[PDB]
Every structure is written in C-alpha cells, then in structure tokens.
Design a binder for this molecule. Structure first.
Ligand SMILES: [Fe+2]
Ligand SMILES: [K+]
Ligand SMILES: [K+]
Ligand SMILES: [K+]
Length: 571
C-alpha cells in the first residue's frame, strides 16, 4: 500500500493548518490543527498536532510514509513574492514535521502541490464520480482566485483561471469585515443575507456575463509589492468602494474593559443586522458571478456533473442554487472545500501519481480522534461529576430531545470541516418553535438571526426533501416537501429551504439508531444538529473539551461515549 501524509499550514502568515493520511487511497486519519490546539483557524503553524495524531492513529512513523505532500506550491510563492526559496527538502521537512515530534531515519519524498490542484483533487477524487467539470472558487492560491478545470480519466486539466485581485472569496470576506461580522466569519454573512433585500447586485462594481464576471473596481493584474497575496490591496479597494456606494460606513470594532467579565472584550460599534441589505446584495453578487463560472466550465467540458471546492464552496446557499440550475445534474462538494482540505487534496494528487486509486468519501467526515470508554471515564473521573451508563443511551437521548432538552453528543471519530455531523454536536428538537431562540440566545448567547439545520435519516429524506439524494455534509441547501413545510420550524426556513444532513446506518450507526428512536416519538426521525462549542472556541474534540463546554453552557445533558451526564440541579 502507498501511505501519503498531506499537510497544510506553515509558520509564516498561513491559516487552516491540517493533516490527512491516505493509506491505499483510503482516509486513515484527518484532523484540523485548531481542534487539537483549541486555537481557532490554525494560524501561523505547521500542522504539528494534526500530523502527530494522523501517524498515531495509523500506527505509523514518518519512516513508514511513501511521501509527504503540501497543499501549496510554497517554493513558487517564495520565489515570486519573497525573493527566493531558501530551504532544502530536508530543511522544509524540519519545519513541517519538527524532529522533536517526528523522529525519522531518512527524509520521505516531499511534494509541493499547486494550491488549486489540491482543492480540485479534494473534490474530484473523493466524489465517487469518474468525470465532471471542476470549479475552484477561493480567496487566493499562489496567484489565481478561480480555476476552471476538466476532471476525467483520473486526470485534472486546467481550462482557465482568474487573477487574485478579482477574488470573490476576498470580496465576500471584506464585506463580512465591513459589516462587523469579521472577515474570519463569512458564514455569518451568508446567514445575515437571508434577512436582507437586494437592491442592485452589481454593487456598482461587478459586471456579469454568461461566463462569469468582471470587476471594474480594481486592475485584475494588481499585485501587492509588499506581500505575497492580494488581500490587503483588495481590502483597500473594497472598503473605499463600499463606503462610497453604501449608506453606512464600515462598522468599527470596539475594545473596552467589561467589569462583568473582568477583561477587555471586543464588540462592534453598530449592530451588524443593520447591514443586512449589504449582506443580501453581496450574497446575490457572489451567486450571480459563480452561476456564470459554473455554466461556463460545464459548457466548455460538456459535463453535467459539477465539482466545487475552494473556500467559497462552503457557501451552502449558493450551492443549493447551483444544484437547481438547468445546466447541473449532479454536484459534489467535499466537507473540506476550504483550505483545510488541501492537505487531503495534496495527499490524493500524490497518491494518484504513485498509482493508487482513491476511494470515495462515502457520506461521512468522521476521520478525527475517537476515545474509548476507559478514556472518556478518565476525563469524567477528573471532574468529580456524577454520571450514568444507560442501558440504551440512544433511546434516552431521543427522549430528552423529544421533550425539548438540548443534548451534547460526543461520539466516535471527530468530524472534519466546520459543520457538526453527529460526532461532536449539540442536538435539539427540529419540531419546536422555541428551540431556535433557546439555543441562539440562552445556550450560545449569540445572534438571534442565526439559522439552524437538521439531521435526518437518509431512509426518510425522499419524503422530507424535494430531491432524492445524499446530503451528507450540510453543505448544500434544498427545499422540504409540502408535508414538512410547517412541522420542522427550528430547522426549515419560511421559504421551505433547509440545509440538511442525511444519515445512513453505515455512516454512523449510533446517530442513526438515536434518530430512529426519536422518529418513534415525534413522528419524524429528524433533529436540530448544531456545533458543539460556542462562538469563542473550535468544535470540541476530546472528552475533556466536551465536559469543559458542557459545564459552561446551560445544556441539559451530555452523551459522551457510553456515558450520560445531566446538569447538576441540586442546590
Ligand atoms: Fe484555497
Ligand atoms: K455613502
Ligand atoms: K438541476
Ligand atoms: K447530575
């Protein structure tokens, strides 16, 4: 078997560090650095913890690897932007895989994979489809912000690219920053957009055409002479433009000592909800641009299957509108469409070059660490909390959810990507018309306007959803059928749209059993499934992380491995 370790993350100005290990084309392990370090977004680091976990999980050392692959062409970026690539392969490996954590006798072959090739590999090779059009829409790779390519016969061939100064991902991050949501939280902008109305989707900046878009605000060949990407140049141009054309100036961040918290805390000067029409208009602009790019690559390649990756591929609202287009029959977007996926993509590209066949992802993203009952018990015994070991944990959790309680669920291998998918989730009733406000305001103390989404059995999804297909990742919106347009108020929008996870018995037996039991109580085997964290931390990974979060949030119960902990309500 070939064993290839893919990596993302570097100590200089990088984000989304992660590591993925392919063994004979199968995902043996995959983790994001932030989940193990507890530092959101995996900034400015090699993926030391994630790679250490992957090797441990597989029972390997670096000497057992056939290759190490990195999801950017770093030598090219250093040569073009920083005056030269100074590292031998051995020196680069010492930075990526420091010897104090990764002892080795010799160096594995090191491969640098062009960033958009890594994104494209993370979609195509794991899709279960033998051919299709590839659309990569990113912030920026080494140079380009968009790649259109043709995936066929195991090969990916580039058709066209768009230069970085025209980035749709940077545009959307800059609007998110302008509204006060923050450029690091573009998912919040997508949720805010649902509450606004679009006036003029060009924003007096875009011109749209049947193949995509033009941006008249900035020279497409603009390059920052003092940086290695175009983010600061695009930021300056977009902030100036938005202040000219939109009725509100930028929201500002405010840092003030809060005596209730005993710390300086960051807030915004205005409520970001005031910018909802800008959010709606930016989302409409993004959608129209991407519809053109998607139509273009499908038409050029003669395909009707669309593979999307790059960070903009996390835009589930946009993805759902692509799926319904007359030009698209099938679509695949991996849960790791953002830069966290280029570790996996780089490993895949290299594994394919080495002659392996890559297995489909298969309706799960559960590749991170898991913990045995003894390991969970060790973490529980640290807290001193009382707990139970239910004879039928799934049936008890279903009854708690049916009654309107919120249950933390930490089971099996951690899912990868930004969405909880029944491995590290907070669960609540899909049928309750008060549950959305309860979890947004009482549990998470976040914005009232944030949406929630459901998990449901794949075996009922053809009845619940208008499309009979797998939706394993909560990465694509669709509509419910009439019979469910009012029954599921916490997880279905007024317009009947929803962003589902379908669950198969093979994908997640425990979660499947719990939803089955819940269906016997509330009629539909469907629940609300949100991230097990709050706004200030990554999704929990270890049993100790789950207990720490459980203890600070007014959650009713925690099902962690085979154990059930309930809030200590004795005065
Ligand atoms: Fe990217
Ligand atoms: K203005
Ligand atoms: K369609
Ligand atoms: K208790």
């Amino acid at each position: 078997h070939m064993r290839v370790l893919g990596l993302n993350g570097w100590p200089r100005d990088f984000h989304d560090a992660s590591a993925a290990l392919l063994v004979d084309g199968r995902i043996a392990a995959f983790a994001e650095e932030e989940r193990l370090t507890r530092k959101k977004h995996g900034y400015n680091t090699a993926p030391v913890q994630a790679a250490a976990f992957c090797l441990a999980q597989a029972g390997l050392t670096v000497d057992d690897l056939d290759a190490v692959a990195f999801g950017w062409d770093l030598p090219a970026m250093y040569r073009e932007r920083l005056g030269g690539w100074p590292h031998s392969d051995s020196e680069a490996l010492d930075i990526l895989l420091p010897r104090d954590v990764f002892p080795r006798r010799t160096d594995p072959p090191l491969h640098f994979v062009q960033h958009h090739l890594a994104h494209a590999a993370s979609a195509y090779y794991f899709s279960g489809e033998d051919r299709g059009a590839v659309l990569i829409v990113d912030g920026q790779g080494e140079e380009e912000c968009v790649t259109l390519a043709h995936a066929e016969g195991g090969k990916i061939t580039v058709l066209d690219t768009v230069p970085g100064a025209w980035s749709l991902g940077f545009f959307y991050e800059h609007v998110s920053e302008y509204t006060g949501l923050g450029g690091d939280n573009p998912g919040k902008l997508m949720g805010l957009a649902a509450h606004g109305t679009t006036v003029d989707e060009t924003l007096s900046a875009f011109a749209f055409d049947s193949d995509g878009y033009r941006l008249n605000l900035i020279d497409p060949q603009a390059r920052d002479p003092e940086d290695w990407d175009e983010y600061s140049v695009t930021e300056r141009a977009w902030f100036a433009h938005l202040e000219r054309i939109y009725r509100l100036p930028p929201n500002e961040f405010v840092r003030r000592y809060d005596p209730a918290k005993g710390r300086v805390v960051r807030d915004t000067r205005r409520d970001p909800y005031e910018y909802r029409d800008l959010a709606a208009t930016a989302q409409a602009a993004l959608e129209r641009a991407v519809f053109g790019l998607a139509d273009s690559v499908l038409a050029r390649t003669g395909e009707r299957t669309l593979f999307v990756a790059g960070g903009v591929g996390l835009n589930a609202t946009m993805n759902g509108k692509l799926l319904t287009r007359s030009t698209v029959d099938k679509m695949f977007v991996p849960p790791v469409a953002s830069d966290i996926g280029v570790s996996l993509g780089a490993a895949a590209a290299v594994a394919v070059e080495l002659g392996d066949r890559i297995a489909p992802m298969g309706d799960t993203a559960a590749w991170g660490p898991e913990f045995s009952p003894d390991q969970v018990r060790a973490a529980l015994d640290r807290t001193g909390l009382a707990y139970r070991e239910p004879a039928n944990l799934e049936r008890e959790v279903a009854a708690l959810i049916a009654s309107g309680k919120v249950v933390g669920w930490a089971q099996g291998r951690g899912e990868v990507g930004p969405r909880a998918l029944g491995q590290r989730s907070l669960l609540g009733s899909a049928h309750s018309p008060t549950m959305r406000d309860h979890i947004n305001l009482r549990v998470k103390d976040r914005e009232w306007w944030r949406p929630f989404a459901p998990s449901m059995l794949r075996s009922v999804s053809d009845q619940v959803l208008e499309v009979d297909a797998d939706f394993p990742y909560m990465i694509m919106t669709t509509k419910v059928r009439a019979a469910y347009a009012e029954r599921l108020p916490s997880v279905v929008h007024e317009d009947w749209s929803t962003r589902p996870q379908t669950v198969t018995e093979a994908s997640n037996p425990r979660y499947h059993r719990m939803l089955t039991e819940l269906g016997d109580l509330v009629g539909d085997p469907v629940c609300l499934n949100t991230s097990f964290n709050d706004r200030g931390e990554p999704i929990v990974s270890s049993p100790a992380d789950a207990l720490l979060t459980f203890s600070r949030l007014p959650i009713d119960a925690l099902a962690v491995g085979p154990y059930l902990v309930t809030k200590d309500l004795r005065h």
